Amino acid sequence: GFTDYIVKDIALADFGRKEISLAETEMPGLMATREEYGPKQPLKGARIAGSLHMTIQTAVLIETLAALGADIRWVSCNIYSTQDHAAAAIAAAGIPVFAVKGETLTEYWDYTAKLFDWHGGGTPNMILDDGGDATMLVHAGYRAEQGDTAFLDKPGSEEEEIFYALVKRLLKEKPKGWFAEIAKNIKGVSEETTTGVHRLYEMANKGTLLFPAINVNDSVTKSKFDNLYGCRESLVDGIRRGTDVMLSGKVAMVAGFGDVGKGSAASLRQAGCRVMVSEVDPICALQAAMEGYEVVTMEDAAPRADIFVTATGNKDIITIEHMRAMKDRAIVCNIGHFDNEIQIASLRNLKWTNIKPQVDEIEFPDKHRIIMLSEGRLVNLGNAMGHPSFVMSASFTNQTLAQIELFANNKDSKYAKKVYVLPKTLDEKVARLHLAKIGVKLTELRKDQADYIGVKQEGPYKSDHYRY
Amino acid sequence: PGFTDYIVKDIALADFGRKEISLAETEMPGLMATREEYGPKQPLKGARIAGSLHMTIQTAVLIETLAALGADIRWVSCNIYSTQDHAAAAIAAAGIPVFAVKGETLTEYWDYTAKLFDWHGGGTPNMILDDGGDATMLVHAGYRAEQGDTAFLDKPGSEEEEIFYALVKRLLKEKPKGWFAEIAKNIKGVSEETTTGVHRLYEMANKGTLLFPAINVNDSVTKSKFDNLYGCRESLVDGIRRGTDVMLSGKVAMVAGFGDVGKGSAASLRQAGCRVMVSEVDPICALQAAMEGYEVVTMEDAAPRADIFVTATGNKDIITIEHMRAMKDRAIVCNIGHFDNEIQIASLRNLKWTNIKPQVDEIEFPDKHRIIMLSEGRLVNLGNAMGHPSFVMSASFTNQTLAQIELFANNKDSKYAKKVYVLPKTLDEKVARLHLAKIGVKLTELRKDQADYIGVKQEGPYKSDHYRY
Ligand SMILES: NC(=O)c1ccc[n+]([C@@H]2O[C@H](COP(=O)([O-])OP(=O)(O)OC[C@H]3O[C@@H](n4cnc5c(N)ncnc54)[C@H](O)[C@@H]3O)[C@@H](O)[C@H]2O)c1
Ligand SMILES: NC(=O)c1ccc[n+]([C@@H]2O[C@H](COP(=O)([O-])OP(=O)(O)OC[C@H]3O[C@@H](n4cnc5c(N)ncnc54)[C@H](O)[C@@H]3O)[C@@H](O)[C@H]2O)c1
Ligand SMILES: Nc1ncnc2[nH]cnc12
Ligand SMILES: Nc1ncnc2[nH]cnc12
Ligand SMILES: [Br-]
Ligand SMILES: [Br-]
Ligand code: NA
Ligand code: NA
């Protein structure tokens, strides 16, 4: 029997299994990775602590890791992103998983801590992260365990106080040197998303990064696929399920025109909205204008737009003064990694009327209302099902290759305590594994053609500086 | 005083050229703002710039920006069909030496290139501004042979190659001993516009044969992600319509390559109503095309199917004689990469050509099926229409102007070695900012805490050097 898990309802396991099987067909990169590396067992002996949205897509990633020999414990990286049938299927598979759609913030962080209590005794020796939270727990406890505890008493956020309480409690409950023990045993971390990678470079630059990191976000086959087309498909998906609103003929405002903001603006435009964009980057703003988006300030958009999407990875994008100016029943959501892009806490003395899970109506003093999705959390994961499997297969094949490099291909210490990206050969290899399913017929260079443009026939085909 | 130091189709076109230059000025705020900012400061006073770059109206605005900054100038076009004759006439009528005719011969093309280096008043140039690297390459071949390596000069390859070798020997015969070493020593740098030219530069740098510092303007974000992409999106179909007047809605089009030019070319045709198929050798680029809903096929798959074919690779031997034998009657074939060997045009000389109009030819095969060829396989957007529109050229040419300033005025301490550089992101962002007012953008300003929160200064730069946009 198996009891080392927390999920919503284990009876959803058969439903999750059915959808996982369907996803496998949609994820040739992961399936082909199992076929190539399965016999090789490169992950035998790995103890991977995973912190990433516990979805059906993630379930295929987890079982790819296992098929390569990895021992695993897993949590979601957001309180609303778990798909409970995915989590149930992983638990029924005998993998410790702690993930519930709609868990509390305190549950979220205690579940993260369970990553590090390994079954059979000990600690993990790998981390797979999305947003850096698990990585941040190891570094925060380590910093405190070494005596610099001052920051632990100086919070300024609901989440951050809960997080600091976790770190104190772990220091009080766990053996000496538990964080030093963890930090010693972690061979590396692979990080999924822009915000988490930002956290890594803050540690790298300060000289506090405790183990090698691979930046999976900046694989071309991640950042130019997941962030772009993934959001192009899943943003309006989340809006439709939450609101069932007609998109044709409405005006939408997207804050940000990086990879996520580009995909977000395209999602709304393709659905029929007239899309305006904000930006602070003059290059990205010129991109938005040349694509036919009107580029305006949030002050300018607030009285006018029917729908608002923050996509910046920054904070305080949609403020309480913006929401006071919005038309009655304007829709507001967030597709960046963290909820502080919208001033959700400034709304809490207002009347909230819940409509359905992850959909609330908020009334202002002058009677106008707004429709908030997922309380400002990631709308594509909170209100729909995240990115579809196929594009997630590209991201998670990168993730698996990153795990293999850090765990198995660091005998010569080629990875120091810095942040790395996968080589272009592996980036191109990820793309190759997805060509058959979509029906691409790749042209083969002749040798004189390859010489002509200065590449080998087998690649890589571009300079490391190429932007695609 | 009278001015005679030029070669143009017809100098009576100058008033016409001047009118369209004036209109282009309004569409190129980046160059006009650069004039306002740098004119008074005269950063290129003393510069003698040899320019090899499509002699279009857009280029004329660049020329007069360089002049307004203090530069002394001589200019030629970098393709036999890309010149706009009214633009060349306006530059000549302004007293600027220029040698460019739309439809010039290959022999004329290289003879005019050599004329850039005989400077009015005596002497040589001290700067080069290049598009494709022909002018740079004439210097390095001449220098290389002036040193002693005479071998390569007696090996053809194509028709152009033979002519090009013939020029350097004539220049070795007629000019004083040491002429090329003396050019090479006075050239303070070169700025290069295009992907093929930059590939030529890096190949020289890796071989240790690059003679002077070089700035890769192509790989500024405000160039490659705008000019190459949106420019071709607007001027490819423009070239096809003017050449053929064909209905694009309903047709199947094939684009070879899905780099920046291929991306913009496929978009040009899709937006015009075509169903677009694409070829690629790069699996990442091919995956991008398929995620945009383009069918990714081989040129052999497309030959009997597509109504229109566009090569956009910067490679060679993309559309072969075997492909063209397979094409349906009166398929349209053209090329938007920098050089004309993407299509095996030489192989087509064997068949019966009927000229339709300038830069449009019908070619008949033994079984009587025919194809329509645009610009004899040269750059279709510049041969058959007017190249990229002014506004997107303003970004590219502001980059060129800043690159000329860097190499001519900001290299007193040799901070630029004999290597290939790109412009800093601060200048890349600068270029974009100069175009925001014209296109109506209202930029948001970060507050101090928001700038700290994402790790940037309020005034930028906003992205890591690794950022792909
Ligand atoms: N929901 C998802 O499934 C998903 C997927 C990938 C990434 N993300 C997250 O989305 C966020 C954005 O990621 P990204 O890859 O697009 O990063 P990015 O750096 O590529 O783009 C962010 C853009 O926001 C702009 N910006 C910053 N502050 C702004 C402001 N005050 N006003 C207007 N624009 C501003 C920046 O100039 C930048 O161009 C991150 O938090 C990332 O982790 C979410
Ligand atoms: N006409 C214009 O106005 C204009 C403007 C800019 C650049 N150019 C020229 O266009 C050419 C392409 O430039 P780019 O910036 O797109 O370079 P790029 O490297 O970004 O794109 C070229 C693509 O061609 C692909 N390719 C190479 N050989 C191939 C083959 N045999 N079959 C299919 N695909 C193949 C490469 O994989 C690559 O993705 C260059 O010569 C450049 O100088 C023309
Ligand atoms: N479906 C998904 N699964 C996991 N992480 C995701 N991030 C975005 N979409 C996702
Ligand atoms: N109109 C134009 N002028 C100069 N160079 C160009 N390259 C592409 N289009 C051009
Ligand atoms: Br109010
Ligand atoms: Br035939
Ligand atoms: Na999904
Ligand atoms: Na033009």
Author numbering:
A (entry chain B): 6 to 473
B (entry chain A): 5 to 473
Study text:
SAH, which is formed upon methyl-group transfer from SAM, must be removed from the reaction equilibrium (which is shifted far towards SAH formation) by its hydrolase (SAHase; De La Haba & Cantoni, 1959), which splits it into Ado and homocysteine (Hcy). In this way, SAHase is a key regulator of SAM-dependent methylation reactions and of Hcy levels, which, when elevated, are a risk factor for neurodegenerative diseases, neural tube defects and cardiovascular diseases. A typical SAHase protomer is usually divided into three closely connected domains: an N-terminal substrate-binding domain, a cofactor-binding domain and a small C-terminal dimerization domain. The substrate-binding and cofactor-binding domains are separated by a bipartite hinge, allowing them to oscillate between two conformational states, closed and open, during the catalytic cycle.
Only the Ade complex crystallized with a dimer in the asymmetric unit, while all of the other complexes formed a crystallographically independent tetrameric assembly. The incubation of ligand-free BeSAHase (§2.2.2) with Ade resulted in crystals with a dimer in the asymmetric unit, from which the complete tetramer is created by crystallographic symmetry. The first four residues of chain A and the first five residues of chain B are not visible in electron density. In each subunit, one Ade molecule is found in the active site, accompanied by a sodium cation. Also, one NAD+ cofactor molecule is found in each protomer. Moreover, 570 water molecules, plus two bromide anions and five ethylene glycol molecules from the crystallization buffer, were modelled in the electron density of the solvent region. Ade molecules were found in two structures. In both structures, despite the absence of the sugar moiety, the architecture of the active site is preserved, as observed previously by Brzezinski et al.. In a pattern of molecular mimicry, four water molecules imitate the positions of the O2′, O3′, O4′ and O5′ atoms of an Ado molecule and create hydrogen bonds to the corresponding side-chain atoms of the protein.
